[PDB]
Structure 1
Amino acid sequence: PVSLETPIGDEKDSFYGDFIPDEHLPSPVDAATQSLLSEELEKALSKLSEREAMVLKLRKGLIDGREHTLEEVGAFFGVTRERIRQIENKALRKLKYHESRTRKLRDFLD
């Protein structure tokens, strides 16, 4: 490896490390993009009933951070895995219709 303190133009003026961008921390543009993404996702999930919206949030892990199986959401709401997978399906499909109509979430797809 090379020293970040290596001079480029002689000595005092600048360091090799002064030209190196930080790729880890998100730029304000990026953080803003995630903010608008979460907000728009909630805006899209408000057009669904709270049950199907909650099922989708659990299945994709927007709630506790992790994605539950069909048996755990089925045991949470108290239905069969087929029923909850189908609620997930109709929620996803209603999201497809809402999206095709409004076209709000297209830009975020990059």
Structure 2
Amino acid sequence: SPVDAATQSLLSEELEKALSKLSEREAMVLKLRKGLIDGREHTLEEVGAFFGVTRERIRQIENKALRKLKYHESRTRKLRDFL
């Protein structure tokens, strides 16, 4: 519907507001893990074959992104209602 197309095109907008504040590789391990690129969720195993890192720098690579994005919330408070 128009309301859905609206909110789906406002979620992507208010999310690539997070590809910035993070970085280029941080905001990409999240894309493979959550499936933004291929549609399927690649484990910290397969992802290790795209940056060289093993299954525990990816974890800190991921958790640094999320924990940083969690602080970008409660300061922009945009993504709450988005349920």
Aligning the two structures, in what range does the TM-score lie when normalised by the shorter sequence?
A: over 0.9
Tell which has more relative contact order, 1 or 2 (C-alpha 8 A, sep 6+). 2
Q: CA deviation at 1:94?
A: 0.3
Give 1 or 2: higher helix fraction. 1
String of CA shifts for 1:17-46, please: whole Å, max 9, x gaps: xxxxxxxxxx11011111111111111222
CA distance in 2 between partners of 1:49 and 1:34 (Å) = 23
CA distance in 1 between partners of 2:62 and 2:69 (Å) = 10
CA distance in 2 between partners of 1:100 and 1:56 (Å) = 21
SS, match of residue 50 in structure 1: coil
Unaligned 5+ segments in structure 2 are: none
The two structures have a TM-score, normalised by structure 2, of: 0.92
The two structures have a TM-score, normalised by structure 1, of: 0.71
Residues paired across the two proteins, number: 83
SS, match of residue 100 in structure 1: coil
Identical residues among aligned pairs (%): 100
The aligned residue for residue 81 of structure 2 is 107
Unaligned 5+ segments in structure 1 are: 1-26
String of CA shifts for 1:46-93, please: whole Å, max 9, x gaps: 210111100011111111111101011111111011000111001000
1:92 pairs with 2:66: yes
Across the aligned residues of Structure 1 and Structure 2, the Cα RMSD in angstroms comes to 1.0
CA distance in 2 between partners of 1:28 and 1:36 (Å) = 12
CA distance in 1 between partners of 2:13 and 2:39 (Å) = 17
Choose 1 or 2 for highest CA Rg: 1
